Design a protein around this ligand. Structure first.
Ligand SMILES: OC[C@H]1O[C@@H](O[C@H]2[C@H](O)[C@@H](O)[C@H](O)O[C@@H]2CO)[C@H](O)[C@@H](O)[C@@H]1O
Length: 377
């Protein structure tokens, strides 16, 4: 069932797109990039002070990408939020539009270009990623209502493939405190106050009620439960939204044909993880770590796994080990058929990662892009 005539579904570990009108059904791949800004105080994708928004989408497509993960915050999706940081001289058709109208315009145009869009509820506020899907201030029912409103609106755009429920569930304290102190996300504690896996079924079910044709992207947490995390030597060193070690024993209960697990994984430019030390076997020790944290969900369990974020400076003003790290990760994704992904980020203005575009928001980093395009064939 679909309001657009397009229906998305997971068969095995492959995402398929169905056109109910022509009857066409083909598998699709997501060669994506994250274009952020709608989750920041700007309330609009960044770079429009230097580029025309349409030109940005065209350039993204020209490089072989066919998908964009679009992060947003609660404020950006409500009527009337004023965006800041747009050169209207370059973006005349954006004059007088609120953030919601600009998002609509961008998504509609991305569709004309054949670019898929994944909506990502990145932050409740607009300044940072919260560890849980609710705060002292904002309840879970508010979170879900925000999603319901977003789904009823954007569900009408054919190229929107679904929802990445919550960006990077994580913890702010250490374990074992973290598993019960209630300040962070968990998985398999059988505790509804902090179990992201239990939360995902709830949020996801609400969204599917209004957008049945959508896919539901579920990220990992940081820590899961002490049994799971302790059963692996690097079980306490997974990235925020990067721990899917608990999926085996605690699958997320959403229809199999709608669920997509979406882990995040980073390099040394983001955090100097202990396993990045050469004396620890870096980078040849990585495949097994990636396998344990999330790879097995696809390779062993057969689920669709779409890396939601990964990136780094690739040696440009950053830790030189990051070049090796990205080269190794892409090697591994290609070998193991992790064909769907979203790179962080299209934007060059990411403090610890830089992006595909250089600081001038116009030219790209050739070596970084040449490594990544191996995934695009
Ligand atoms: O996940 C992105 C996030 O990582 C933060 O570092 C964490 C890391 O995720 C975790 O695996 C490690 O064990 O602890 C560190 C410190 O919290 C990093 O600080 C953020 O900048 C980054 O966005």
């Amino acid at each position: 069932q679909t309001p657009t005539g397009i229906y998305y579904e997971v068969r095995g570990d492959t995402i398929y797109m169905i056109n109910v009108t022509s009857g066409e059904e083909t598998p699709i791949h997501l060669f994506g990039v994250n274009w952020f800004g709608f989750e920041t105080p700007n309330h609009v994708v960044h770079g429009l002070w230097k580029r025309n928004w349409e030109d940005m989408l065209l350039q993204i497509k020209s490089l072989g990408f066919n998908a964009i993960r679009l992060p947003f915050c609660t404020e950006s999706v409500k009527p009337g939020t004023q965006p800041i940081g747009i050169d209207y001289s370059k973006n005349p058709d954006l004059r007088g539009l609120d953030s919601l109208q600009i998002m609509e315009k961008i998504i509609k145009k991305a569709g004309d270009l054949g670019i898929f869009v994944l909506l990502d509820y990145h932050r409740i506020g607009c300044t940072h990623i919260e560890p849980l899907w609710y705060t002292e201030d904002f309840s879970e029912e508010d979170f879900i209502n925000t999603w319901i409103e977003v789904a009823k609106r954007f569900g009408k755009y054919w190229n929107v493939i679904g929802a990445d429920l919550k960006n990077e569930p994580h913890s702010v304290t250490s374990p074992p405190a973290a598993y019960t102190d209630g300040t962070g996300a968990t998985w398999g504690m059988g505790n509804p106050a902090t179990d992201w896996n239990l939360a995902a079924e709830r949020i996801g079910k609400a969204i599917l009620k209004v957008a049945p044709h959508w896919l539901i992207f579920v990220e990992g947490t940081q820590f899961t439960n002490p049994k799971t995390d302790s059963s692996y030597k690097w079980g306490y060193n997974a990235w925020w939204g990067g721990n899917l070690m608990a999926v085996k024993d605690y699958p997320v209960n959403l229809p199999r044909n709608k669920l997509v697990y979406s882990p995040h994984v980073y390099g040394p430019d983001v955090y100097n993880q202990p396993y990045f030390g050469p004396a620890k076997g870096f980078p040849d020790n990585l495949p097994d770590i990636w396998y344990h944290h999330f790879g097995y969900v696809k390779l062993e369990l057969g689920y669709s796994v779409v890396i939601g974020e990964f990136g780094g400076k690739y040696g440009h003003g950053g830790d030189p080990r990051d070049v090796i790290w990205q080269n190794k990760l892409v090697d591994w994704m290609i070998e193991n058929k992790f064909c769907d992904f979203f790179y962080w980020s299209w934007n060059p203005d990411s403090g610890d990662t830089g992006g595909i575009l250089q600081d001038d928001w116009t030219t790209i980093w050739e070596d970084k892009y040449n490594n990544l395009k191996r995934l695009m064939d």
